[PDB]
Each structure stands twice: as C-alpha cells, then as structure tokens.
Amino acid sequence: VPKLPCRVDGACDATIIKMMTDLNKKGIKVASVGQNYLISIPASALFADQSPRLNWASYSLLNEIAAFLKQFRKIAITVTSYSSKYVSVKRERALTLARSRVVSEYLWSQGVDSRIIFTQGLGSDKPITSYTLGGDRSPNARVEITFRRAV
Amino acid sequence: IIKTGDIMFAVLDTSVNSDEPGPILATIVTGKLKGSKLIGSFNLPSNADKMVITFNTMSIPGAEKTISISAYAIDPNTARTALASRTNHHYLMRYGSLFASSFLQGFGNAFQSANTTSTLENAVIGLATVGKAWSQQAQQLFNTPTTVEVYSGTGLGILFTQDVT
Amino acid sequence: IIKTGDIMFAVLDTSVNSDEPGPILATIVTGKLKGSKLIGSFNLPSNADKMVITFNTMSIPGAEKTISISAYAIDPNTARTALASRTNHHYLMRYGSLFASSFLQGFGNAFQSANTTSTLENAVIGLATVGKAWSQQAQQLFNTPTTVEVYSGTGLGILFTQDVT
Amino acid sequence: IIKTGDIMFAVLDTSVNSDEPGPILATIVTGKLKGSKLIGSFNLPSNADKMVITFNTMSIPGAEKTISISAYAIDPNTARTALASRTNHHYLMRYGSLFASSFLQGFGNAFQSANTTSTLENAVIGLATVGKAWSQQAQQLFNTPTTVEVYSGTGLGILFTQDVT
Amino acid sequence: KETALSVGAQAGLAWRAKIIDEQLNKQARNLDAIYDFNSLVLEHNILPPVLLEGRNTLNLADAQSIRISDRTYKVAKQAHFITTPPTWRQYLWMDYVKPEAPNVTLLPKTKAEKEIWCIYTERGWKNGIDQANTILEENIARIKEDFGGMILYRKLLAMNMVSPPYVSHTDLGVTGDGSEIHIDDRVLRITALPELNVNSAEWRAAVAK
Amino acid sequence: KETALSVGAQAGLAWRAKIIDEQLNKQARNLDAIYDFNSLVLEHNILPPVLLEGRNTLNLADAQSIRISDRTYKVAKQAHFITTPPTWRQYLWMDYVKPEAPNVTLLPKTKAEKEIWCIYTERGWKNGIDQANTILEENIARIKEDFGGMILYRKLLAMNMVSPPYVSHTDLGVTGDGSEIHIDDRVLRITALPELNVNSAEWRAAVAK
Amino acid sequence: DGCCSKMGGINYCDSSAGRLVCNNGFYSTCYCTRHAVMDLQFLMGCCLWHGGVYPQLNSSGLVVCNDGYVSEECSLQK
C-alpha cells in the first residue's frame, strides 16, 4: 500500500457525483450510457453572437470542466460544434471549426490526460429540434464533447 | 526401526516396595510391538520425592530374541516422574519414640533433682533409668528412611533410550 | 547445515523435579526442522536461582539419523535463562524445626534454673529433654538445599552452539 | 582482514545473571560485516566492580564459514569495562540475619543473668537458645557473593585482539 | 508470530480451495457440455494427438545471425489408444484438505500480541487465497492448451497437412489348448503414426463465403 | 565525528539522487524527443557504429621525436544487430534506495559534540549532493558522446568515406521432419562490416550556400 | 477508506481489469488486483536497467551489477 497506489491519483467518486450534479443543475447536458460519455453545452454560454470569442467568465466554467475531466483515464476526445443557419453553409462551418479549434487548444493547454483530440464543426447540418425560432439562443446551436472510458 | 527417544505405553501388573531389588515385569500393549514384555529392576533414591523403574531386558514374541533396550517409567497422564504412593511411613514412629525416651529421662532426673525443694520416687526411678537405654537405641534406629512402593494395577509410560530393530 | 549460534524454538512437554537426572525430551516445532525431537538431561547448580537443560541427542524424522548438536534453553520472548518454578521450597520447615528444638532446650533448662528463685517440673522435663535430640537431628538435616521443578506445559528457546550437516 | 586492535559494535539481545556459565549471543550491527552472529561466554571476577564478556565463536553470514576471533566488550557510551547492573543483592539480608542471631543469643543470656540483681523467662529461653544455631548457620552461609546480571536490550562495543582473513 | 502466519496461510489455502471446488461442483454440467473428448475420439478409440502452432518466429544467435520463419508446427503427444475419454476432472479439480491441528501453546496473551496474531493470520489468509487462484489459473491454462491442440489436429487433418493413423487388424479362429479356449482372436496394430506432411504441393486450401 | 561525516554523506547522496531522478521524470517527453534512436537506426535493425575524431594532433615521443597530423579518426564499437532501439533510461538514471539504518558509534553528548554532529551532517549533505552532480555529469557526457558518434557515422557515410554495411539473406522452403515443420526458413546475416577507406579518389566533398 | 462512497456501496472486484464495481453500474477508481493497468513512473532499488543485484555477499562495501557495471551509488564510501 505505501508502494503501490491503491487507487488512481486524485480520485473521489463523491467529488465526481457532486460536480456532475452541479453541472446538471447549471444546465449542462451530461450523458453516461455504457462506457461512452457525452457533455453538451449551449453555445450562448461560451461564445457571443456567432462570434468565435470568449468572455472572461467563460474561462471559469472551462476551468471547472477541465477539473472534472482530469479525474478519468481516456485516449481520444472528440469535440463537435453545431450552429444555426445564418448566411451560408461555409460561413457556419468555418465558425464551428474555429470555435472547436479554440476550445480544443485551450483544453490541451490544460492538463488533459489524453492521447488524441479530434475537433470539427458542422454548422447547422445536424439539427436536434425542429423548432428554430431563436437565433444563437436556440438550443440547436451547441458544442459536444464525447469520449469513451479507458478501462 | 524405532525413533531415538520416542514415547510408548505399557501395562504394569506387578508391584513391590522400594526395599529389596529384584526382577520385575511389565507388558507393552500398544504400538508396533504387540504382546511384548519387559523385565528389569528399580532404584533406591536418597530423597523420597520420586521413584523410578529400570527396564532393559525386552522379551518380544515372534522370534525367541531378547533385545535389551533400557527404559524407565513416568506417571501416566501426568507427564511427571514421581511415584503415586505414600512417603510418610516412618516419620511419626521414630519421632515419638525419641521424644518419649527423652521425656522419660527428663522426668526421672528432674523429679529426683527437685526432691529437696514413695510412688513419686518409683516414678522417678522408672523414668530416669529406663529413659537412657531407650533414647540411645532410638537414636541408633532413628536413621531409618521412609520407603515408597508402587502398585500392581496402574499403567505406565516408557520413553526410548536407544534404537532397535 | 545450521548457522553457528542462531535461535530456534522448541516445545517442552514433560515435567520432572531437579532431583534425579534422567532422559528428558522436547520437540522442535518450527523452522526448517519439522517434528524433530531432542533428548538430554539437566544439571543442578549450587544455588537455585536458575535452571537449564543440556540437550544433545537430536532425532529428526524422515531419515534414520541421530545427530548430537549440543545446546541449552532460554525463556522464549524473555531473552533470559531463568526457569519458571519455585525457589523457596525448603527454608521454613528446617528453620522452624531447629528453632522449636532450641526453644524446647531453653525452656526446660531455664525453668529448671528458676527453681531456687509438679506440672512446671514436667514442663521442664519435656522441654529440657526433647529439645536436645531434636536440635542435633535438625543440625544434621539442616543442609538440604531448596530444589526446583520444571513443569510440563512451557516451551523453550534453543540457541545453537555447533554446526550440523 | 581486521587490523589488530580496532573497535566494532554489536547488540546484546539476551540477558542473564552472573551465576552460571552458558552460551551468550550477540549480533554485529554495522560495518564491513553485517548481521554476523557471535556466541561466547563470560567470566566471574573476584569483586563485582565490573563484568566482562569473552566473545570468540563469531560466524559471518554469506558462506558456510566460522572464524574464531576472540575479543572482549567495553561499556557503550562510557568507554569503560564495567557492567550495568546492581551489586547490593544479598548484603543486608545476611548482615541482618547474623546480627539478629547474635542479638537473640545476647538477649536470652543477658536477661537470664540480670535476674538476680514467667513470660520474661520464656523470652530469655527463646532468645538464648535459638540465637546460637542461627548464628553458626549465618556464619556458615554469609560467604555467598552478590551476583550481577547483564541486560537483554543493551548494545556493546567490542575491541579486536587478533587479525582474520 | 511466523507460526501464526504459516497456519493462517494453510487455513486460507484450504478454505479457498474448498470454496472453489464447491462452486465448480455447483456449476458442473456446462463444463462437460463444453469439453467433450468423446465427440473427438476417432473411429478406433484413438486419442488424436496434440499440435502446437506458432506464428512470426524470429530468434537471434548473435550479431549477423538471426533466423526467422512464418509459422511452425510441433507435435506434443503422439496418439495412443485409450479405454475411456478423459474429462475436466483430471485438469480443473484440485486436492482439498483441512488442517485443523494448530500446535499452539503460544496463545497471544497481550493485547498487542493478539493484534499482531490477527494481522499475520489475515495476511496468511490472503496469501493462501492468491496461491489457490494461481493454481487454478495454471490448471485451466493446461486444459485449454490440450483442447486447442486436439482441435488444431482435427483442422489440419481436414486441411490435409497431416497423416491419418493407418490401422490394421489380424483375425484368428478357434484358439487355445484343450484346457483353455478363446473363440475369435483379434489383434489390433497401428502402422502409420500420425505425422505432418512435407510435400506442400498436395496441400489443398479452403476459402469460405 | 567521521561517522557523522559518513552518514551525512550517505544521506546527502541519496537525497540528491532522489531529487534529480524525480525532476528527470518531471521533464520526460522532451528527453526522448531529443534522444530519438529509431530515426538513426538503419533499415535492417542494425545499430550503426560509433566514430570518434580529433583535430590538430601532435605527439612528442621523446627528445628528438615529434609527430603531427591534421586529424585522426577512430572506430569505437563495430556495428551490430539490435532488436529494440536503446533509450536514455539506461544512460541517465541513477539508483535510489533510502537508507534507514541510523546507528553511530560516538553519539554526541556535550554541546560541542552536538554542534560538531550537526555541522558534520551538513557537510555530508553537501558532499553527497556534489558527488551526485558529478555522477550525473559523467553519465550525460557518456550518452552525449555516443549520440554524437552515431550522428558522425551517419553523416560521414553520407559523405562517402566509409563502407556501408553489407547484409545477406537466404531463403529456404518448408523445413523440418514429419513431427516438426517450419514454413519458410529465412537466414539473415551481415557479411561486410562498415569500415573506413583510404582511396583518396572516392572522396566527395560538399559545399553549402 | 471507502471506495464506492456516496453510492449504494461496492458490489465486487472483477479481476479481468483488477477493478471494483459498486452497486450502481460504475467502475470504481480503486483497484483490487495487481494485474491491472497501473501508473508507474518511479522505482526503488538499484542496478536498474542492468544485470540486477549480484547475489553474492561480498566483503567489500561495493556492489556491482550482474552485467559488470558497478553501482557506487548503491555502494557505500569513505
């Protein structure tokens, strides 16, 4: 026991459940079915109006996200960006790509214990709800982080 | 083939007092050697705190052979060497004889001495004169030790001393 | 092969007084040696402040061989050589016998002396005459030392003295 | 190779009183030789002003070897040859026994003598008659010396005398 | 101390062995269902031999010396007759005893003595447990390799890479003297021990769909 | 006194070794990033040999004996086969076992004894630390020179002044008896070891821009 | 010391991954068997990446690994 670590470093299921509940309370969609894990966040909480930029407060939320992610063991992390239809297809795709690149770069700057990170965005080509009256406030625009438990 | 210094049980059938050495016999009832008997003698200790039996001449049937593995006895189920018998045989007799002879001497001499300051004279006579011979004979015989004696109906335990075949 | 001067545990199972030396057996119960027995005898020191066992006749099971490694015994987890038994066995008996004999002599002679300055005479008689024989016998037998007696339910620690093969 | 007349250190883990000789073991704690065992014996000096240990049978681990370098002990952190123990073990006991025996003799005889110039007579009796035997026995047994006892948790230093290979 | 440790090890090993054997008996039928040597026994009560296949072989002798091959095949045990097919009994089951004779006159008297006695008993318990687990693992590995060897032999015999055991029988009529008589003597002989072929041209491949 | 010196030196050396090892583990990725080996490895899993050089050589043998040279080149170790490429693990790591046997002959008793004990512990700490630094420096120099020799060999071979290694391969079909079979025997060996050449004609230089 | 805390409790240890399983369907962070993917970065002992510790107890305080390379660091000095 003083030689071999009994559990992985900085591990607490209590903390895991606590911050998962906190994220659900704040409204971040957290899904854990099987060994595949998904976390979805509305784009309005992080980016401005179709704007690939970060308000200062969003960094605290990203800090919390990274702290949660630190706990697990993983290999590959996939990040996908979805937006609303604004002018064209290429404009939305480029905005999604830029946002994904930015968030991925900051996550990598953080101690994300992974091996490969894939990033992409698909504008509005994969809708999640027929109702689309709202703009960026609409839930259809979003960002998803997906991965699989690494044993 | 027998271990060097192992345990065995035997049945004792005959007894004797620790007064005259003589041939004695016992019977091994268990173990590999079955129906075997063992003859020997005993010892006389200076102190009456224990009593043991010397058993060497082993008569085993099967073949008319006589191995002489020497062995002793221990108190059954007690794992001790003392003998289950009495040891207070001749303390009181010699004590009383000596003290009575002394009392006779003293009575005669003192009651004669205190005469200045006929039946009482006769008592003085008897005590003073018969005390001395009794006292000297009692001192002569006072050196008798108290004996011990085994009983003829108790089993025994035997520890080995040398190996045989 | 056994280290020159190391420690082993053993079990002592049979009891005996330190009065008559003889065959005594113990059992090594741990270590590389398993189930081995060890026979020997004891010694009597001048004073009863300790008790030890001389043990040489080692019989190990498995094969029929008889090594003679010599070693003594110490109290396990005590790191001392003392034996847990009685040491004050035979002081009071002889003390009281001698002192009573002396008191008898003194009482008889002094109460005879105090005559110048029948039952009293008889007390003089008994004391003055039975004190002396008891006093001389007590002076004779006063020399028996206090014995010790090991018990049948304590183990022992054996430190080796010589090597084996 | 050991230079002639250097200092090594070992730990004594077993205790014993200086009454009866026996095997005593220590273990070298550090230095070139590690974990080596060392069995030897002691000596009894004329007076209890010190106590020393002769250590000769030293076994080094690693191989089946046993050299016989002989060396003694010094008091750790004292750089002296004394032993840590008590020395007043049986002084006052024999002193008081002898003094009380003499006092008994004197009380009986002097209080008998001072009579000219019954319970008091009885006190005279007991003292005057039991003092003498106790006095002679105490003079007989007064010669037993005070023993010393080493401890089972004290280290020691050992100075070498000869070289080895 | 060490006595407590050793007796705890023994007790733990015995208890774990009893538990595992009991569970093996509790779930039994599926085992013989999976392992059916009898279904594999050839037409003349011959246990088919066992084969071992290795892939991507390379060994170095020293510098400038390395020997490499694609696959290798080795015969473990030659085929032989047998009255009754084996089972999982001779591989999976392991011996059980119960040591219930602790020669302990050294009862822990002090509280710390009892505590250390307990902890040493615990570590002995777990040591026996893991020992039993390792033993079971070795046994199951052995039975698996035997079964796989037999299956591979069947595969190669189908593929025409080995030689079926050639057998023969010799018959004699009424036999014996005027005191002892046998009716119909028959002697069974094997000539071609099952061995691998070397003429690769005769090899016939197989393609599924 | 000297006992305190020695124990302090031991503690200091061990402590400094532990610290340097943990900092080396802290800075890990860039280490192997720099000291890659597979890139230098040849195409047949051959460790290229090690080459050393020297410039402006001069030897005075004795009075009346002087010899000079422009440069000299030497081969340290001949090339050899290799299965897995090496790494800095067996070059820069230093061992660490925590010493936990405090026992000293002359324990300090007076105030002077205690203060000299303290200062001796301090200087032993310092001595151990500097000695550990020396060990690290020796190791890093060794691995650096080996890496440089490898690089030098590669670039000199590019310069075409040394013989490239020569590798032979021989193929055999199925091999073995009727009980043991190998599919395809393949023997790989090295025939001509790399070495220098003295024919001045085959020397091609290079010019940068 | 609780591993499956703030849950329904542990369920059992699976040796396929050397990992604990709680009452809820989650793999606990704690391990149970040595045969699991651990995270080792620092090792004790000496003669690492060498022939190991030579078995023989030498009189000298120097210890040399079985490959002939010596370990003065594992050894003592004067």
Coordinates of N, CA and C in Angstrom, one line a residue, chain E residues 21-123:
Chain E
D21 N -13.8 -25.5 -5.2 CA -14.2 -26.8 -5.6 C -15.7 -26.9 -5.5
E22 N -16.3 -26.3 -4.4 CA -17.7 -26.4 -4.2 C -18.4 -25.6 -5.4
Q23 N -17.9 -24.5 -5.7 CA -18.5 -23.7 -6.8 C -18.4 -24.5 -8.2
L24 N -17.2 -25.1 -8.4 CA -17.1 -25.9 -9.6 C -18.1 -27.1 -9.6
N25 N -18.3 -27.7 -8.5 CA -19.4 -28.7 -8.5 C -20.7 -28.1 -8.7
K26 N -21.0 -27.0 -8.1 CA -22.3 -26.3 -8.2 C -22.6 -26.0 -9.7
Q27 N -21.7 -25.4 -10.4 CA -21.9 -25.3 -11.8 C -21.0 -26.3 -12.5
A28 N -21.7 -27.4 -12.9 CA -21.0 -28.6 -13.4 C -21.3 -28.9 -14.9
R29 N -22.6 -29.1 -15.2 CA -23.0 -29.7 -16.5 C -22.4 -28.9 -17.7
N30 N -22.4 -27.6 -17.6 CA -21.9 -26.8 -18.7 C -20.5 -27.2 -19.0
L31 N -19.7 -27.6 -18.0 CA -18.3 -27.9 -18.2 C -18.1 -29.1 -19.1
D32 N -18.8 -30.2 -18.8 CA -18.7 -31.4 -19.6 C -19.4 -31.1 -21.0
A33 N -20.4 -30.2 -21.0 CA -21.0 -29.9 -22.3 C -20.0 -29.2 -23.2
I34 N -19.2 -28.3 -22.6 CA -18.2 -27.6 -23.5 C -17.1 -28.6 -23.8
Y35 N -16.6 -29.4 -22.9 CA -15.5 -30.3 -23.0 C -16.0 -31.7 -23.3
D36 N -16.0 -32.1 -24.6 CA -16.4 -33.5 -25.0 C -15.3 -34.1 -25.8
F37 N -14.3 -34.8 -25.1 CA -13.3 -35.5 -25.8 C -14.0 -36.7 -26.6
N38 N -15.0 -37.3 -26.1 CA -15.6 -38.4 -26.7 C -16.1 -38.1 -28.1
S39 N -16.7 -36.9 -28.3 CA -17.1 -36.4 -29.6 C -15.9 -36.3 -30.6
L40 N -14.7 -36.2 -30.0 CA -13.5 -36.1 -30.9 C -12.8 -37.4 -31.0
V41 N -13.1 -38.4 -30.2 CA -12.4 -39.7 -30.3 C -12.6 -40.3 -31.7
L42 N -11.6 -40.8 -32.3 CA -11.6 -41.3 -33.6 C -12.3 -42.7 -33.6
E43 N -12.5 -43.2 -34.8 CA -13.3 -44.4 -35.0 C -12.7 -45.7 -34.4
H44 N -11.5 -45.7 -34.0 CA -10.9 -46.8 -33.4 C -10.4 -46.5 -32.0
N45 N -11.1 -45.7 -31.2 CA -10.8 -45.4 -29.8 C -9.4 -44.9 -29.6
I46 N -8.9 -44.1 -30.6 CA -7.6 -43.5 -30.5 C -7.7 -42.0 -30.1
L47 N -7.0 -41.6 -29.1 CA -6.9 -40.2 -28.7 C -6.1 -39.5 -29.8
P48 N -6.7 -38.5 -30.5 CA -6.0 -37.8 -31.5 C -4.8 -37.0 -30.9
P49 N -3.7 -36.9 -31.6 CA -2.5 -36.2 -31.0 C -2.8 -34.7 -30.9
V50 N -1.8 -34.1 -30.3 CA -1.9 -32.6 -30.0 C -0.9 -31.9 -30.8
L51 N -1.3 -30.7 -31.3 CA -0.4 -29.9 -32.2 C -0.3 -28.5 -31.6
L52 N 0.8 -27.9 -31.8 CA 1.1 -26.5 -31.4 C 1.6 -25.7 -32.6
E53 N 1.0 -24.5 -32.8 CA 1.3 -23.7 -33.9 C 1.8 -22.3 -33.4
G54 N 2.9 -21.9 -33.9 CA 3.5 -20.6 -33.7 C 3.6 -19.8 -34.9
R55 N 3.4 -18.5 -34.8 CA 3.4 -17.5 -35.9 C 4.4 -16.4 -35.7
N56 N 5.0 -16.0 -36.8 CA 6.0 -14.9 -36.8 C 7.2 -15.1 -35.8
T57 N 7.9 -16.2 -36.2 CA 9.0 -16.6 -35.4 C 10.3 -15.9 -35.8
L58 N 11.1 -15.5 -34.8 CA 12.4 -15.0 -35.0 C 13.3 -15.1 -33.8
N59 N 14.5 -15.7 -33.9 CA 15.4 -15.8 -32.8 C 16.8 -15.3 -33.3
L60 N 17.5 -14.6 -32.4 CA 18.9 -14.2 -32.7 C 19.9 -15.0 -32.0
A61 N 20.9 -15.5 -32.8 CA 22.0 -16.2 -32.1 C 23.0 -15.2 -31.6
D62 N 23.4 -14.3 -32.5 CA 24.3 -13.1 -32.1 C 24.2 -12.1 -33.2
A63 N 25.1 -11.1 -33.2 CA 25.2 -10.2 -34.3 C 25.4 -11.0 -35.6
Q64 N 24.9 -10.6 -36.7 CA 25.0 -11.2 -38.0 C 24.4 -12.6 -38.0
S65 N 23.4 -12.9 -37.1 CA 22.8 -14.2 -37.1 C 21.4 -14.1 -36.5
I66 N 20.4 -14.1 -37.4 CA 19.0 -14.1 -37.0 C 18.3 -15.1 -37.9
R67 N 17.4 -15.9 -37.3 CA 16.6 -16.9 -38.1 C 15.2 -16.6 -37.9
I68 N 14.4 -16.5 -39.0 CA 13.1 -16.1 -39.0 C 12.2 -17.0 -39.8
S69 N 11.0 -17.3 -39.4 CA 10.1 -18.1 -40.2 C 8.7 -17.6 -39.9
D70 N 7.7 -18.0 -40.8 CA 6.4 -17.5 -40.7 C 5.6 -18.3 -39.7
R71 N 5.5 -19.6 -39.9 CA 4.8 -20.5 -38.9 C 5.6 -21.7 -38.7
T72 N 5.3 -22.3 -37.5 CA 5.9 -23.5 -37.1 C 4.9 -24.4 -36.4
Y73 N 5.0 -25.7 -36.6 CA 4.1 -26.7 -36.0 C 4.9 -27.8 -35.3
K74 N 4.4 -28.1 -34.1 CA 5.1 -29.1 -33.2 C 4.1 -30.1 -32.7
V75 N 4.5 -31.4 -32.7 CA 3.7 -32.5 -32.2 C 4.0 -32.6 -30.7
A76 N 3.0 -32.5 -29.8 CA 3.2 -32.5 -28.4 C 3.2 -34.0 -27.9
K77 N 2.1 -34.7 -28.1 CA 2.0 -36.1 -27.6 C 1.4 -36.9 -28.8
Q78 N 2.1 -38.0 -29.0 CA 1.7 -39.0 -30.1 C 0.4 -39.6 -29.7
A79 N -0.4 -40.0 -30.7 CA -1.7 -40.6 -30.5 C -1.5 -42.0 -29.9
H80 N -2.4 -42.4 -29.0 CA -2.4 -43.7 -28.4 C -3.8 -44.1 -28.1
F81 N -4.0 -45.4 -27.9 CA -5.3 -45.9 -27.6 C -5.7 -45.6 -26.2
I82 N -7.0 -45.7 -25.9 CA -7.5 -45.4 -24.5 C -8.9 -46.0 -24.4
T83 N -9.1 -46.5 -23.2 CA -10.4 -47.2 -23.0 C -11.5 -46.1 -22.8
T84 N -11.3 -45.1 -22.0 CA -12.4 -44.1 -21.8 C -11.8 -42.7 -22.0
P85 N -12.6 -41.8 -22.6 CA -12.1 -40.5 -22.8 C -11.9 -39.7 -21.5
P86 N -10.9 -38.8 -21.4 CA -10.7 -38.1 -20.2 C -11.8 -37.0 -20.0
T87 N -11.7 -36.3 -18.9 CA -12.7 -35.3 -18.5 C -12.1 -34.0 -18.0
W88 N -12.9 -33.1 -17.5 CA -12.4 -32.0 -16.8 C -11.9 -32.3 -15.4
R89 N -12.2 -33.5 -14.9 CA -11.8 -33.9 -13.6 C -10.3 -33.8 -13.4
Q90 N -9.6 -34.4 -14.4 CA -8.1 -34.6 -14.2 C -7.4 -33.3 -14.5
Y91 N -8.1 -32.2 -14.8 CA -7.4 -30.9 -15.0 C -7.9 -29.8 -14.1
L92 N -9.2 -29.6 -13.9 CA -9.7 -28.5 -13.2 C -9.7 -28.7 -11.7
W93 N -10.2 -29.9 -11.2 CA -10.3 -30.1 -9.8 C -8.9 -30.2 -9.2
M94 N -8.9 -29.7 -7.9 CA -7.6 -29.7 -7.2 C -7.9 -30.2 -5.8
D95 N -6.8 -30.8 -5.2 CA -6.9 -31.5 -3.9 C -7.5 -30.6 -2.8
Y96 N -8.2 -31.2 -1.9 CA -8.7 -30.5 -0.7 C -8.3 -31.2 0.6
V97 N -7.8 -30.5 1.5 CA -7.6 -31.0 2.9 C -8.0 -29.9 3.8
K98 N -8.1 -30.2 5.1 CA -8.4 -29.2 6.1 C -7.4 -29.4 7.3
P99 N -6.5 -28.5 7.4 CA -5.5 -28.6 8.6 C -6.2 -28.0 9.8
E100 N -6.6 -28.9 10.7 CA -7.2 -28.5 12.0 C -6.4 -28.9 13.2
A101 N -5.1 -28.8 13.1 CA -4.2 -29.2 14.2 C -3.2 -28.1 14.4
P102 N -3.6 -27.0 15.0 CA -2.6 -25.9 15.3 C -2.0 -26.2 16.6
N103 N -0.7 -26.6 16.6 CA 0.1 -26.9 17.8 C 0.5 -25.6 18.5
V104 N -0.6 -24.9 19.0 CA -0.4 -23.6 19.5 C -0.5 -23.6 21.0
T105 N 0.6 -23.8 21.7 CA 0.7 -23.5 23.1 C 1.1 -22.0 23.3
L106 N 1.4 -21.3 22.2 CA 1.8 -19.9 22.3 C 0.6 -19.0 22.0
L107 N -0.4 -19.1 22.9 CA -1.6 -18.3 22.8 C -1.2 -16.8 23.0
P108 N -1.7 -15.9 22.2 CA -1.3 -14.5 22.4 C -2.0 -13.9 23.6
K109 N -1.1 -13.6 24.6 CA -1.6 -13.2 25.9 C -1.8 -11.7 26.0
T110 N -0.9 -10.9 25.5 CA -1.0 -9.5 25.5 C -2.0 -9.0 24.4
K111 N -2.5 -7.8 24.6 CA -3.4 -7.2 23.6 C -2.7 -7.0 22.2
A112 N -1.5 -6.4 22.3 CA -0.7 -6.2 21.1 C -0.4 -7.6 20.5
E113 N -0.1 -8.6 21.3 CA 0.2 -9.9 20.8 C -1.0 -10.5 20.0
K114 N -2.2 -10.3 20.6 CA -3.4 -10.7 19.9 C -3.6 -10.0 18.6
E115 N -3.3 -8.7 18.6 CA -3.5 -7.9 17.4 C -2.5 -8.3 16.3
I116 N -1.3 -8.5 16.6 CA -0.3 -9.0 15.6 C -0.6 -10.4 15.2
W117 N -1.0 -11.2 16.1 CA -1.5 -12.6 15.7 C -2.6 -12.5 14.7
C118 N -3.6 -11.6 14.9 CA -4.7 -11.4 14.0 C -4.2 -10.9 12.6
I119 N -3.3 -9.9 12.6 CA -2.9 -9.4 11.3 C -2.1 -10.4 10.5
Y120 N -1.2 -11.1 11.2 CA -0.5 -12.1 10.5 C -1.4 -13.2 10.0
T121 N -2.4 -13.6 10.7 CA -3.4 -14.5 10.2 C -4.1 -14.0 9.0
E122 N -4.4 -12.7 9.0 CA -5.1 -12.1 7.8 C -4.2 -12.2 6.6
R123 N -2.9 -11.8 6.7 CA -2.0 -11.9 5.5 C -1.8 -13.3 5.1

